[PDB]
Every structure is written in structure tokens, then in C-alpha cells.
Design a binder for these strands. Sequence first.
DNA 1: CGTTGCGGCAAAGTTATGGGTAAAGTCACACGTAGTCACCATAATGAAATAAGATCACTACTGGGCAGTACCAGACTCGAACTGATG
Length: 51
Amino acid sequence: EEPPPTMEEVGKRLGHHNRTISRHFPDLCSAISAKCRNYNKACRLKSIEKL
DNA sequence: CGTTGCGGCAAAGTTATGGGTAAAGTCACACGTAGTCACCATAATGAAATAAGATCACTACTGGGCAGTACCAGACTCGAACTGATG
């Protein structure tokens, strides 16, 4: 979806500290972080072009 | 030789020049000589003015950082429970 959420939003929704997820599932968490960062970078790029 | 003209000699005669002495002239004392523009250069300010300087205001150009976001673990601390020695 839009602004794929970040680590903070996912952790707040799950009610767990970020280290709790981070100590067991690094690959998928890095996948979510990369997706969010890529969406932000793409949106910034379109904003730069349009501006 | 007796007479006549000529020339030397030495007073004598005539001018000239620098002195002295009485005596006819001469002239200032009469309130009065200093006094007054004209002249152009130099100091010397005081004003006129400076030529640059000082600051305001505006216009445009270009460095460039801060509040905030985000992840990936490592490491200490400790609920909660397990398990062994004991009086």
C-alpha cells in the first residue's frame, strides 16, 4: 500500500519492542525496511522531477 | 775829428695780484613751511567651494545546515522458572 509502514509502526501495532522481532527475523524485516525506503526514494524522485 | 745811427744798462713806468681797513650798501625782523594724494605688493582672514568620502537603499547571486528519520545488531539486566544440597 501507500507509504509502506516502517519498523516503528509495525512494532507499535504488534506491541513488541523492535529488538524482539530483530533478534529472530532479520531477512524479512530488512525486506520491509528496503520496501519502505524504496517507496520513499521513488516518491522523492517523482517529486523532484515534477518540481 | 766831428757827426749820426745803433745797441747795452739800469733806473722808471705801467699792469697785475693778493693783502688790510674804514664805509657805503644789503637785506630780514616783521605768525608761519612742511603737507597730501597716488602707488602696487604681501599678509590675512572669512567665505565659497571642493573632491572625495560615507552611508542608505535596492537587486541579484550563490554557499549551505538543522530538526527529524531509520536500521542493525551487541550487551547488560532480570522475570520466571529449574534443579540440587540441606537441617
